[PDB]
Design a binder for this molecule. Structure first.
Ligand SMILES: N[C@@H](CCCC[NH3+])C(=O)O
Ligand SMILES: N[C@@H](CCCC[NH3+])C(=O)O
Ligand SMILES: N[C@@H](CCCC[NH3+])C(=O)O
Ligand SMILES: N[C@@H](CCCC[NH3+])C(=O)O
Ligand SMILES: [Mg+2]
Ligand SMILES: [Mg+2]
Ligand SMILES: [Mg+2]
Ligand SMILES: [Mg+2]
Ligand SMILES: [Mg+2]
Ligand SMILES: [Mg+2]
Ligand SMILES: [Mg+2]
Ligand SMILES: [Mg+2]
Ligand code: NA
Ligand code: NA
Lengths: 297, 306, 306, 297
């Protein structure tokens, strides 16, 4: 009864070259996702360094994702979150006007809105567009938590709001959400627990690991959606070691390191305050990667 | 000699739907008649094992004599049925935990549950030595139990796995930790162990990841539902197991609106399954507001009698 | 060349009683007239410095243009008085934080406050490089600001001390971390730095351990009391400083019953110091119950007007 | 208006010899506390391994402390806490009948009583004796927190209850307590922050560090009680490094290690589940100790 964006999705890294977005590398990486079974891509979330891109660069990345996915089955769920509602509304409207299929919108970071404030924030965002809106709860980064009651209120009050990406390590809340509002789309935002969230009726993932292993994350998700829980769990178990090492330092530091280690990006460049991992973690990531089958271009 | 290759050797296991039994009091004493009646009710409603005197059974405030009496009643009531007794045997002192383990073995328990030491916060090395001493003292199965919110310590995944591999009788862990990532970690690195849900609201997610049973609070009140849930999941009927887990969320949540076992004893009293709402200090009755919340949540569930 | 021995070299410091200024809105826009009037009221009530556009001033929802306008109003209103402007200049993007730092320098601020990056959780190495870039971009004092409950990250004691020793202009930290152990750690290992209280309820404990000022929310409402408290403590009149800190506990606590600045703007509205109770989303009015709690707590304090 | 036990106090380690309490070593260690300015000793708290002593051994330790302090100015604040009220009442009555000056009583661990339960627990304990009772809040070990409201209610409702030993890293609560009930005795239970608690009007410490450095902890406390905050802070600052290293593993593992390293106990023996520190932390403790002046016997 709602328009939705579900399935296996990738929180795209943003490659830099000489401090600027490498727009050619960005398109090439998206094509690699498309060719490895991914159902949607998410430009410029946390993994794509939304904090340090300018609003102009953020918009360019959304445009490249839309352009690269045009004529393919793959949807663009554009990163559009902000701690300021007026900025989040501006990004939402841009995404809509520029052909995104939907938006992801992180809970406001830093300023710690109340539940009433979160409700008004997301209602303003939903009112600004006519495309699907996925909430995104990540309290370890934002300092706030969108409660189950608030999520369900938004889902019932706002046609566009169709679910939530949960990055909260809280499978109890995942049960609470789908037991009380089974129509919503619960999306895993934590790779290590993709299979538990899917096996409780979640309908997709927004993945960091899929930057490196898109075929494995897509296979996992599609097995679970087909109720082949044995085969989905097998992949989730196999992926635990890489899923864990990709957070040995704050995301996206390990995943960009891994993409560089596999020759998939040309330089290991971040924007401050992000920076290279320690040499010890660089080497740890490399050793974990050697246990997995990494697709090229 | 000791060795590191026990993981695929015969570990007698105790799995399935299990109940963390409340301990009813009458005039301050254990009501042994009521205790037996309650265990019989679990047996008649599909439960696979009972756990006398865990946290839910007020292990902290029973004397060592009363703790042993409850184990004996559980063994006697389950004798001749298929239902096993996984006796609560944990302590923050290794010498007390070894004493309880030996008692359980000598008095016919099928296995023991053994909570991580509370209060004194041992290191991982100390936890390893604690559980090695317990496992070496008996020849019956030992289930570890991690509940960091109550103990102040955590048995790490690496320590759990070492104990499983290093000790013949340690066969798994009951997790009450709100940490489905750790549940994945445990079974991805040591799939031979028995992961047991210790948090009712997430029984189905743990079982669907390959956990093999539950040690339940809710089953004191709704044994039939918890056993049906567990057995559906063990049969890989995940649709039907999830349906019950979802239906149970409201009661599963309200049973922790105050520290367990305050809500479950309140519910058992409200349903007419125990005669008085009695605890031993420092536990006590819930607030009037929470008493009323529990009563309202219960109206949506069909409560079996005796 | 860079070096590691800045600790005893001239660090121009900004210390004393300071106010994290609220930013009043009128019809959604910054009310620049009200802002100036409020700053003048701080000046006339003993405050040593003002902090435009920190967390309390809704830095997240001001545009970069409005943020700069508020810095300019603060500088102009304090010109010719002894009161200094420690401009809010923090960001989760180093390039934005450097831009704000340079603006503050070029537009006459006396120094900058710079919050640890929120949301993107940089490593300690990244925080070091962040603040090195900021400090190297200007020649005015830089105060670090740690508030892990809002940012999701913590500037460790070792990183703070390295920055103090390695950068000429970094002179201390504003701690809003509920961690008096860290306050001891900081000043026991680097007593030359300026530790500034960022949590009003514990202003006196931080000052009595050798902290040298406060960056206050409560002083928006009670500037006289917060400045008197701070100045008593700096004079080693701990008895009189503690007396005020104790008297202020109730208002200090209620001003965080919802996320700052929701309660302080509510109180400023209730006292008649701002004309409308307006925030920018995602901030909004308090619940009716908390509005009423704030109003009741305020009745015990004598509120200065203009 | 209340009888109180305040000043510099030591949470006594319990030495073992061949697995039994070394009663001669215990007395010798208490005499060393007496001769180095300490105002009271606390037998068998957390630091004295209350969890693994038997009830008989616990009682023996209280008796040795009372006997050794008789005829000196030093008081015995006997450890008497339990997670079972009936056990805590039994210990309280024993201490009273055996000549202790007061009791310390830890908040119930493991079973997580509600505030009403904590109130009834401590009221039962206070009703059982006619000597002073000090509450003890240590949420990191017990899993519960005695709220300020509950502490103040107990102080006002129970003559014997005269204050609280706080081990909660919460100087805000320390302000809350003494601003609303300035008659109580707030006692520092965390060595690193002894000086902040004293300078806000706390009136003593129950120390781990004083096992090793009793003269320094007593000097610190007495300077603060005399309003010589400069000299108290100086000692608190000097002690930070040892105060921190004594919790590099769970107390009392480091402090027993330090006492062994200084030749003050003959064997580094614990009762399971406590055990020796790692060899790396053993060496770290030794290196920190070399910066301090350690009194002998
Ligand atoms: N650094 C600011 C602006 C980023 C704008 C592009 N996403 C923030 O993190 O909100
Ligand atoms: N109250 C003590 C003894 C309990 C003995 C019977 N389980 C404890 O919690 O360890
Ligand atoms: N909302 C963005 C931009 C604020 C710009 C003015 N301080 C942030 O919080 O970083
Ligand atoms: N091990 C039990 C009994 C200790 C009895 C002597 N303090 C407990 O920690 O409560
Ligand atoms: Mg977003
Ligand atoms: Mg093995
Ligand atoms: Mg147990
Ligand atoms: Mg592991
Ligand atoms: Mg230096
Ligand atoms: Mg700032
Ligand atoms: Mg340090
Ligand atoms: Mg005690
Ligand atoms: Na609509
Ligand atoms: Na009395």
């Amino acid at each position: 009864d709602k328009n939705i964006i579900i399935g296996a999705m990738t929180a795209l890294i943003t490659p830099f070259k000489n401090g600027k977005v490498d727009e050619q590398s960005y398109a090439r990486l998206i094509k690699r996702q498309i060719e490895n079974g991914i159902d949607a891509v998410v430009p410029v979330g946390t993994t794509g360094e939304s904090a340090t891109l300018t609003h102009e660069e953020h918009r360019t990345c959304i445009e490249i994702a839309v352009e690269t996915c045009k004529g393919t089955k793959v949807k663009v769920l554009a990163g559009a979150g902000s701690d300021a509602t007026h900025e989040a509304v501006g990004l939402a409207k841009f995404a809509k006007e520029h052909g995104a299929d939907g938006i992801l919108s992180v809970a406001p970071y830093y300023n710690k809105p109340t539940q009433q404030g979160l409700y008004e924030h997301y209602k303003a965002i939903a009112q600004s567009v006519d495309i699907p809106v996925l909430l995104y709860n990540v309290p370890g980064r934002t300092g706030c938590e969108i409660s189950t009651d608030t999520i369900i209120k938004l889902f019932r009050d706002c046609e566009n709001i169709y679910g939530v990406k949960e990055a909260s390590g809280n499978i109890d809340k995942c049960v609470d959400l789908l037991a009380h509002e089974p129509r919503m789309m619960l999306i895993s935002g934590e790779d290590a627990i993709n299979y538990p969230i899917l096996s409780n009726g979640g309908k997709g993932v927004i993945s960091v690991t899929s930057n490196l292993l898109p075929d494995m994350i897509s296979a996992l998700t599609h097995f679970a959606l087909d109720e082949n829980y044995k085969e989905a769990k097998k992949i989730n178990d196999e992926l635990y070691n890489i899923n864990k090492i990709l957070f040995c330092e704050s995301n996206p530091i390990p995943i960009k390191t891994a993409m560089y280690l596999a020759g998939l990006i040309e330089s290991l460049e971040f924007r401050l305050p992000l920076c290279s991992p320690s040499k010890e973690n660089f080497a740890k990531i490399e050793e974990v990667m050697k246990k997995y089958k990494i697709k090229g271009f």
